[PDB]
Amino acid sequence: QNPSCKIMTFRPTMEEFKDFNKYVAYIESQGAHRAGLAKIIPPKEWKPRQTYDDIDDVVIPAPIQQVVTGQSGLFTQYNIQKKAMTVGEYRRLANSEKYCTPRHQDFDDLERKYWKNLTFVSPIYGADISGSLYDDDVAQWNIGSLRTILDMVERECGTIIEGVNTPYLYFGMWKTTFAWHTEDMDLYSINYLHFGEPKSWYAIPPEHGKRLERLAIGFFPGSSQGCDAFLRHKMTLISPIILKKYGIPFSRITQEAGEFMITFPYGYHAGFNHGFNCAESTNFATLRWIDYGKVATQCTCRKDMVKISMDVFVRILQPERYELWKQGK
C-alpha cells in the first residue's frame, strides 16, 4: 500500500468523515500507518466549537518552563513547573519580545531557527491541561468521546488516566517542544489544532522504530543503563541533521489550525509549536493495537508511569490466544 512510508494527508467528505472508527480503518487500508503519522483535514462544514471568544479566562494550572541542554543536535529537555496563569496572561507572554516567533522567510528558515536557538531562552508550555474545547453539540471526531476499545480500561477498574483516557489541552508558544516518544503503551493518539500558529511534527516509521531506539542508546549510554525505556521519560531531542547523519528514515509535516493528526502504534514522533496556539489530544485504540500493547516497553525507574493491564483486551478480544498468552507463549 504505502511502501515508501510517506506521511499521507486525507481530505474526507462529510459522509466519509462521519464515523471516526471506520475512518481509521480506511486510512490504514491505504497504508497511512506505515509512516507512524497521518494528517486528516476535516470537511469545511465541520466545527468542534462555535467560538473561541472566552478562552483568555481558562486557567493553566501548571505551565512548564522547558529547559533544553546539549549541543550538536542532541539535547535533553527538562520541564520545570511554574505558577498557574491564565491563557490571557500566557498569550501575552507568548507574544512578548523574549518569547515571540522569530522573523523568518519560510518553514526551512523557521526550522533552522528552532534548532539553532533551542538552548537559549526556555519557552513556557501550557501543556497537559485536563479539558476539552469541544461544544457538547458535536457528535463526530469528538476527542472527549471517540468510543474505541480503549474505553474498556476504565470500565474494568474505574481508573481514569488523565490525557490517555481523557482529553488534554496544550496552549503553545514559539519553540515549545514535544520530545521523541511513542505513546504510553504504544497507543494511537489523535491531535486537533483548535487555533493559532502551526505545530510541526517529525515522525519515524514504526518499522524503523527499533533503529531509533538503538541510536538513542548509542547517544546516551548512561540513560539506557538507568532505564530500559528511557525515551519514555520524554526528554530526548534529536535534530533532523542527526537523524540523517545516522540514516534514520523520517518525514516531517506541519499541522495548521483546524487539522487533525493521528499517530499510530509505535510511531515515534517529536516536534514544536511555531507560536501561540491551542491543541487538543487524547489516546485511542483499535484491535490492531492490542499486539503492540502486549509487548510495549515500560519505564522501570519511575513510579509515576502509565501502565495498562492487557489482560482484559486479550481475554475478550483475543480469546483464542488468551490461555497461551497467560503462560509466556
Partner: peptide
C-alpha cells in the same frame, strides 16, 4: 499516573 510532557 497520568500522561505528561515528561522532562521530570
Amino acid at each position: 499516573a497520568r500522561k505528561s510532557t515528561g522532562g521530570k
